[PDB]
UniProtKB/Swiss-Prot annotation:
GO terms for cellular component: cytosolic large ribosomal subunit. One of the proteins that surrounds the polypeptide exit tunnel on the outside of the subunit. Transmembrane segments: none annotated. This is Large ribosomal subunit protein uL29. Keywords: Ribonucleoprotein, Ribosomal protein. One of its GO terms (biological process) is translation.
Length: 50
RNA sequence: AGAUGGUAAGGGCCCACGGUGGAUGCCUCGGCACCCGAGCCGAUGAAGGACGUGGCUACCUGCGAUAAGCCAGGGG
């Protein structure tokens, strides 16, 4: 769990973004919603040791 | 008595200009053949797909719920 509880947080954030997108209120789309390239797989990469 | 000339609804032929049409000419990221290199993939789940994934994405190419992409090395 050295990298978890962070993607739970960032997937919570992306289900603030996808809420904000459906109503007409998401005015930085690719500036925010394509976080999941570097962010979000920011800490979805470790070698599963042991 | 007397004759040729005429009338063009429309037709014919020719000339001029159009439309329809897609031939011809000229192109090539396309294809064919030949010669070279290369030559297997799969329980470490293949070939092939269905579905999906872009913020809006219909389709194609991707790519798999990490879903036009992730991480590291190398080239630029
Ligand atoms: Mg003339
Ligand atoms: Mg003509
Ligand atoms: Mg024509
Ligand atoms: Mg051949
Ligand atoms: Mg396959
Ligand atoms: Mg797809
Ligand atoms: Mg998409
Ligand atoms: Mg979408």
């Amino acid at each position: 769990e050295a990298r978890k509880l962070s993607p739970v947080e960032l997937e919570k954030l992306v289900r603030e973004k996808k809420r904000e997108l459906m109503e007409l209120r998401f005015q930085a789309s690719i500036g925010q919603l394509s976080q999941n390239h570097k962010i979000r797989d920011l800490k979805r990469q470790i070698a599963r040791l042991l």
